[PDB]
Structure 1
Amino acid sequence: MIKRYLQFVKPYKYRIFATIIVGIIKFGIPMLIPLLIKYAIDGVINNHALTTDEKVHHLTIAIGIALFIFVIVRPPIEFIRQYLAQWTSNKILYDIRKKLYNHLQALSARFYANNQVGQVISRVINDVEQTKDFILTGLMNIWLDCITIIIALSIMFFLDVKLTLAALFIFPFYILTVYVFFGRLRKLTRERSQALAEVQGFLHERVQGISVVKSFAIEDNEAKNFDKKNTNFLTRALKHTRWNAYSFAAINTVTDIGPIIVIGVGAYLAISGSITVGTLAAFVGYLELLFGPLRRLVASFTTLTQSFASMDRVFQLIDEDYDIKNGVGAQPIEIKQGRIDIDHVSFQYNDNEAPILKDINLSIEKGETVAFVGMSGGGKSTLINLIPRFYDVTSGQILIDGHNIKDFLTGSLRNQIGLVQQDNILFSDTVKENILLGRPTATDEEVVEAAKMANAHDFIMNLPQGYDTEVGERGVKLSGGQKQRLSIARIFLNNPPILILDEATSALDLESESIIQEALDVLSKDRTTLIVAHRLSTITHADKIVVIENGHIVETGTHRELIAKQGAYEHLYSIQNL
């Protein structure tokens, strides 16, 4: 998996090597200070053989050299070091999200039917952000602390063989301890993030559905439900905290026995006649070089553990399966004559549940306008959505122009099916911007046409700022009949070969309906049109009315014929002016 995440860093290797290089070229600076203390002390006064005009000159080139380095060289190193580090990771994150967003847009209705927006977003934003440390603390810092440890171990190896050994004794345990915690922290972090994710999901869902919370004044009740999730998150976060605290003390207690098992030994050797009490003096001086980095790495460790958890969650989301896939055979197909064929189609949203569409057989010739009617919960919408291939038929096949829906390239198929769903969507944008969804590359002229078509153009003008009026989030700032008509607009703009209208009149008064009815009868003149309707009267003119009951096609016919049959259809119609 590191290999995976690494793939994102790939195009930035150099900038990172650079960040590490400049990183090393930093320790040289802190050492310049103690080096300068020795020069004035031993090179201008303890020299004893210099003029009081000569030594007061060397101190003006040494206090000259220092200033130069620190006021000219260091600043740029400092800067670049950070800017680089950041610029790098920040571009990397940017990249990861670029990919995650396409992933999302490629998931299926199913996915989104069983997932919580807020939770998904939490991953795309928070979890990703969290993997930032892995680039910084991981690939750009950890090393410097190891380089330091090598240098140190090395220097010590010369000063004395067994004395260094005296140190390395700790090392294995240190490693063992890290290993012991790592995993548990990784989970605790994972579980923590997830909780956050769930509060995200909650906030999203409620803030957007407040209308309801407000209406029944269930604020108190819901504020509770919030606290459960908010608390859960807190709890989990504490578990996580406790362990970090715990593991920290642990790893360090080990890292601390380090200088001890050293000093102790360093004495019982210098005195036992093994080595120069100067060696002991020198060696023990470097103790900070060894058990310093080892102490930092404890922190480095921790940070990473958390980061891994995050990249987990990220990849987990990345690894989600696309339910509707294109498959090798993919083929952008032009639908020239709207010929739709539903052969023995049967649908189930899940293996466990019962099918919703059982055995459906229906043929729709180009130009025909087919109406779908029946008790609510029958299957019309489900059936319908099988064509734009929003879900794949369970058993059977649907063919447009003889071509199996599956053999089209998604975008192609879908782009040629103008679909007005029953629960229509609007983004917090401008009226124009919303219609444009039907055909983003459209002439401000064509838009206004669609509008006039959908019987929308008129009320749009009466809107403050007309076609540029910002509709509300979710399109709140408009009537039902109004939102709806904008959806119809999109259709005309799309001007597709196949038109599916699932209750495209729901919210319009009798009059507006009449208009749109005419507008459509026109657009639907020579196109294959599928219509789901409850307001029968606006379906009579259909070429064929299809009655659907409990997932089955029960009746088929012309309004006229169906009425004669005094069957299922008539029953329903008959309920109107009776």
Structure 2
Amino acid sequence: MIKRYLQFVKPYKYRIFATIIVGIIKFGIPMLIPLLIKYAIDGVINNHALTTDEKVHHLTIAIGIALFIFVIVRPPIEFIRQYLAQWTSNKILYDIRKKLYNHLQALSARFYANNQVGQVISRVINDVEQTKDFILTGLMNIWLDCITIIIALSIMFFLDVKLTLAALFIFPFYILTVYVFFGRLRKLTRERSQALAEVQGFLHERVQGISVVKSFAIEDNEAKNFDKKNTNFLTRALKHTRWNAYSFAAINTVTDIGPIIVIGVGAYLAISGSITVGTLAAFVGYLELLFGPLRRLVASFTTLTQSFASMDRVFQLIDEDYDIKNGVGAQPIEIKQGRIDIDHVSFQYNDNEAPILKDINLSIEKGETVAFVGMSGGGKSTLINLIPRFYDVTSGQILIDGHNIKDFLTGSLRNQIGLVQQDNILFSDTVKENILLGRPTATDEEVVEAAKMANAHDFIMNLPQGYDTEVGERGVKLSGGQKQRLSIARIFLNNPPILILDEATSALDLESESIIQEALDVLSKDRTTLIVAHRLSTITHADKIVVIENGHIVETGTHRELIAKQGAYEHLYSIQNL
């Protein structure tokens, strides 16, 4: 998996090597200070053989050299070091999200039917952000602390063989301890993030559905439900905290026995006649070089553990399967004559549940306008959505122009099916911007046409700032009949070969309906049109009315014929002016 995440860093290796290089070229600075203390002390006064005009000159090139380095050289190193580090990771994150967003747009209705927006977003934003430390603390700092440890171990190896050994004794345990915690922290972090994710999901869902919370004044009740999730998150976060605290003390207690098992030994050797009490003096001086980095790495460790948890969650989301896939055979197909064929189609949203569409057989020739009617919960919408291939038929096949829906390239198929769903969407944008969804590359002229078509153009003008009026989030700032008509607009703009209208009149008064009815009868003149309707009267003119009951096609016919049959259809119609 590191290999995976690494793939994102790939195009930035150099900038990172650079960040590490400049990183090393930093320790040289802190050492310049103690080096300068020795020069004035031993090179201008303790020299004893210099003029009081000569030594007061060397101190003006040494207090000259220092200033130069620190006021000219260091600043740029400092800067670049950070800017680089950041610029790098920040571009990397940017990249990861670029990919995550396409992933998302490629998931299926199913995915989104069983997932919580807020939770998904939490991953795309929070979890990703969290993997930032892995680039910084991981690939750009950890090393410097190991380089330091090598240098140190090395220097010490010369000063004395067994004395260094005296130190390394700790090392294995240190490693063992880290290993012992790592995993548990990784989970605790994972579980923690997830909780956050769930509060995200909660906030999203409620803030957007407040209309309801407000209406029944269930604020108190819901504020509780919030606290459960908010508390859960807190709890989990504490578990996580406790362990980090715990593991920290642990790893360090180990890292601390380090200088001890050293000093102790360093004495019982210098006195036992093994080595120069100067060696002991020197060696023990470097103790900070060894058990210093080892102490930092404890922190480095921790940070990373958390980061891994995050990249987990990220990849987990990345690894989600696309339910509707294109498959090798993919083929952008032009639909020249709207010929739709539904052969023995049967649908189930899940293996466990019962099918919703059982055995459906229906043929629709180009130009025909087919109406779908029946008790609510029958299957019309489900059936319908099988064509734009929003879900794949369970058993059977649907063919447009003889071509199996599956053999089209998604975008192609979908782009040629103008679909007005029953629960229509609007983004917090301008009226124009919304219609444009039907055909983003459209002439401000064509838009106004679609509008006039959908019987929308008129009320749009009466809107403050007309076609540029910002509709509300979710399109709140408009009537039902109004939102709806904008959806119809999109259709005309799309001007597709196949038109599916699932209750495209729901919210319009009798009059507006009449208009749109005419507008459509026109657009639907020579196109294959599928219509789901409850207001029967606006379906009579259909070429064929299809009655659907409990997932089955029960009746088929012309309004005229169906009425004669005094069957299922008539029953329903008959309920109107009776």
Compute the TM-score of the two structures, normalised by the length of structure 2: 1.00
Q: 2: distance between equivalents of 1:504 and 1:453? A: 14
Shift of 1:519: 0.0
Shift of 1:500: 0.0
1:340 aligns with 2:340: yes
Q: Which residue of 2 aligns with 1:268?
A: 268
Q: 5+ unaligned residues in a row in structure 1: which ranges?
A: none
Write out per-residue CA displacement over residues 31-62 of structure 1, whole angstroms, 9 at most, x where no aligned residue: 00000000000000000000000000000000
Q: 1: distance between equivalents of 2:141 and 2:537? A: 73
Q: Which residue of 2 aligns with 1:17?
A: 17
Shift of 1:511: 0.0
Write out per-residue CA displacement over residues 338-393 of structure 1, whole angstroms, 9 at most, x where no aligned residue: 00000000000000000000000000000000000000000000000000000000
Secondary structure of the residue aligned to 1:323 is coil
Shift of 1:324: 0.0
Q: 2: distance between equivalents of 1:150 and 1:464? A: 71
Shift of 1:458: 0.0
Secondary structure of the residue aligned to 2:377 is coil
Q: 1: distance between equivalents of 2:199 and 2:278? A: 62
Secondary structure of the residue aligned to 1:429 is coil
Shift of 1:143: 0.0
Secondary structure of the residue aligned to 1:333 is coil
Q: 1: distance between equivalents of 2:297 and 2:73? A: 29
Q: 2: distance between equivalents of 1:490 and 1:353? A: 35
Secondary structure of the residue aligned to 2:345 is strand
Q: 2: distance between equivalents of 1:574 and 1:320? A: 49
Secondary structure of the residue aligned to 2:342 is strand
Q: 2: distance between equivalents of 1:189 and 1:106? A: 28
Shift of 1:285: 0.0
Write out per-residue CA displacement over residues 529-556 of structure 1, whole angstroms, 9 at most, x where no aligned residue: 0000000000000000000000000000
Secondary structure of the residue aligned to 2:204 is helix
Q: Which residue of 2 aligns with 1:170?
A: 170
Q: Which residue of 2 aligns with 1:328?
A: 328
Shift of 1:80: 0.0
Shift of 1:81: 0.0
Secondary structure of the residue aligned to 1:20 is helix
1:287 aligns with 2:287: yes
Secondary structure of the residue aligned to 1:525 is coil
Q: Which residue of 1 aligns with 2:562?
A: 562
Secondary structure of the residue aligned to 1:481 is helix
Shift of 1:524: 0.0
- The share of aligned pairs that are identical, in percent, is 100
Secondary structure of the residue aligned to 1:426 is coil
Shift of 1:88: 0.0
Q: 2: distance between equivalents of 1:332 and 1:457? A: 34
Q: 2: distance between equivalents of 1:561 and 1:328? A: 46
Q: 2: distance between equivalents of 1:381 and 1:469? A: 32
Write out per-residue CA displacement over residues 460-506 of structure 1, whole angstroms, 9 at most, x where no aligned residue: 00000000000000000000000000000000000000000000000
Q: 2: distance between equivalents of 1:27 and 1:282? A: 20
1:258 aligns with 2:258: yes
Shift of 1:200: 0.0
Shift of 1:409: 0.0
Q: 2: distance between equivalents of 1:460 and 1:408? A: 37
Shift of 1:69: 0.0
Q: 1: distance between equivalents of 2:180 and 2:392? A: 47
Shift of 1:569: 0.0
Q: 5+ unaligned residues in a row in structure 2: which ranges?
A: none
Shift of 1:452: 0.0
Q: Which residue of 2 aligns with 1:126?
A: 126
Q: Which residue of 2 aligns with 1:486?
A: 486
Q: 1: distance between equivalents of 2:537 and 2:493? A: 26
Shift of 1:258: 0.0
Write out per-residue CA displacement over residues 96-115 of structure 1, whole angstroms, 9 at most, x where no aligned residue: 00000000000000000000
Shift of 1:262: 0.0
Secondary structure of the residue aligned to 1:506 is coil
Write out per-residue CA displacement over residues 410-452 of structure 1, whole angstroms, 9 at most, x where no aligned residue: 0000000000000000000000000000000000000000000
Secondary structure of the residue aligned to 1:18 is helix
Secondary structure of the residue aligned to 2:65 is helix
Shift of 1:125: 0.0
Write out per-residue CA displacement over residues 240-287 of structure 1, whole angstroms, 9 at most, x where no aligned residue: 000000000000000000000000000000000000000000000000
Q: 2: distance between equivalents of 1:350 and 1:461? A: 46
Q: Which residue of 1 aligns with 2:363?
A: 363
Compute the TM-score of the two structures, normalised by the length of structure 1: 1.00
Shift of 1:184: 0.0
Q: Which residue of 1 aligns with 2:249?
A: 249
Secondary structure of the residue aligned to 2:529 is strand
Shift of 1:21: 0.0
Secondary structure of the residue aligned to 2:496 is coil
Q: Which residue of 2 aligns with 1:524?
A: 524
Shift of 1:558: 0.0
Q: Which residue of 2 aligns with 1:410?
A: 410
Write out per-residue CA displacement over residues 302-336 of structure 1, whole angstroms, 9 at most, x where no aligned residue: 00000000000000000000000000000000000
